[PDB]
Amino acid sequence: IVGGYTCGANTVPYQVSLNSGYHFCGGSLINSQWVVSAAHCYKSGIQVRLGEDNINVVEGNEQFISASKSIVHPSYNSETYNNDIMLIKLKSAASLNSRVASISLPTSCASAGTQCLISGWGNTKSSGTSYPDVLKCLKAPILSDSSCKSASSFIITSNMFCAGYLEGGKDACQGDSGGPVVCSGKLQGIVSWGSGCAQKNKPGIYTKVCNYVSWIKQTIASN
Ligand SMILES: [Ca+2]
């Protein structure tokens, strides 16, 4: 997260870190046994880390639980990032508490102008690299598709939305992928892609979760 602020320990209790020896992506807890993340974060050997603030220090509220199954969206396209969404089932149910909590799925989509909270342990620099230990947070509005497309020349699909600031300075970044975009109390986005970080006319691109709620619910019900 570039241009954000330190969230405060466990103030984003649905945020998870995906760990394969090191943090590599974020995710969001959606019930005690399931996490949603980005398909482009797919790999084997995932340990889900819940209750994290400082990812390099055991602070006392963590739960580390191995993935038992990962399900990349049936239509995920790695070249375009269309349908950049994945479900991860935990081997055992997380113990839910004030620091480890699910985030509600939307029943309807969000609109341009609505403010969202984006969070993660990704790079905090727009030029060069610095990776934080504690969770970072950013408030950012959803942009209209037309404004985003015209400003950026990005090729996106109806399964994506742009959020952020066309002037630059505030954005998600490498290492935030898979993590949450929460708007009006609902998980509306997943950190998906962009070009650089926090550059002028290059806002963040997010998977549009409202298009996937039926797939999420049916997949969890059957698995
Ligand atoms: Ca920790």
Curated annotation (Swiss-Prot):
Post-translational modification: Subsequent cleavage after Lys-125 leads to alpha-trypsin. Further cleavage after Lys-170 yields pseudotrypsin. A cleavage may also occur after Arg-99.
Cell compartments where the protein resides: Secreted, Extracellular space
Main EC class the enzyme belongs to: hydrolase
Catalysed reactions listed for this entry: Preferential cleavage: Arg-|-Xaa, Lys-|-Xaa
GO biological process per UniProt: digestion; proteolysis
Keyword Iron-sulfur annotated: no
Chain positions recorded as Ca(2+) binding sites: 52, 54, 57, 62
Cofactor(s), by name: Ca(2+)
Cofactor note: Binds 1 Ca(2+) ion per subunit.
Activity control, per UniProt: Is inhibited by scorpion cyclotide trypsin inhibitor TopI1.
Subunit structure: Interacts with SERPINA1.
Protein name as catalogued: Serine protease 1
Protein's organism: Bos taurus (Bovine)
Name of encoding gene: PRSS1
